[PDB]
Design a protein around this nucleic acid. Structure first.
Length: 187
DNA sequence: TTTTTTTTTTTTTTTTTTTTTTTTTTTTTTTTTTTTTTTTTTTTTTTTTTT
């Protein structure tokens, strides 16, 4: 939330020149260079796996990789930061968070108290980092269920979540106020 | 007298420790059941004693 708001091969070339200069500046950078090389190699093969059109494309790709490894201007630091951020944002990691969330909701129905308590508490932390996530209907029904759950621990965790979320975003809190202030008499 | 230097006191910040509180789990004394054994009492026959 604080970051986002054939050319790819040319970018790979540019990053290689950046690191190449930094080899002169400081040792151990050669290891990083070889590591990036291997990672590009395996990523092209793994996308290849999913054909003859991309077969010819990847054989020029991979041959260029072999050549360019054998081959061991003016681009600098911030540029390198933004390029590698972009190329990482292409990788199958930045679009993983969503998946992770789903996993968490599998936990909420379980047969052990402590795990559910801690899950709810960490979720409270999660939402209090990014306040615009109480939109997906499944999480809504989750926090409702846990508000009606049959154990005092998860009950206090849930009410703490809902209260901190209400406190953070000043307006738009009159929609949770009723379900909140119902809960005072909870034994 | 005034300027320059030293020291003590007061107050705020922080960090570590302590206390508190609830909750959940555990393991223990407490409580009840059943049995059952002992001991006291009972009986009846045997033994002793009396006319």
């Amino acid at each position: 939330v604080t970051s986002k708001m054939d050319e790819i091969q040319q970018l790979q070339k540019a990053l290689l020149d950046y690191l190449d200069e930094n080899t002169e500046t400081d040792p151990s950078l050669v290891f990083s260079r070889k590591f990036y090389i291997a990672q590009w190699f395996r990523d092209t093969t793994l996308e290849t796996e999913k054909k003859e059109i991309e077969t010819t494309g990847q054989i020029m790709h991979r041959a260029e990789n072999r050549k360019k490894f054998l081959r061991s201007d003016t681009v600098d630091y911030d540029d390198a930061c933004l390029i590698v951020r972009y190329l990482a944002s292409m990788r199958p990691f930045a679009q993983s968070f969503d998946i992770y969330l789903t996993q968490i909701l599998r936990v909420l129905g379980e047969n052990a108290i402590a795990v559910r308590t801690k899950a709810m508490k960490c979720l409270s932390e999660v939402v209090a980092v990014d306040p615009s996530i109480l939109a997906r209907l499944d999480m809504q029904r989750g926090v409702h269920g846990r508000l009606m759950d049959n154990s005092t621990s998860v009950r206090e965790a849930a009410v703490e979540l809902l209260g901190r979320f209400v406190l953070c975003r000043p307006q738009l809190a009159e929609q949770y106020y009723d379900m909140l202030i119902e809960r005072i008499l909870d034994t």
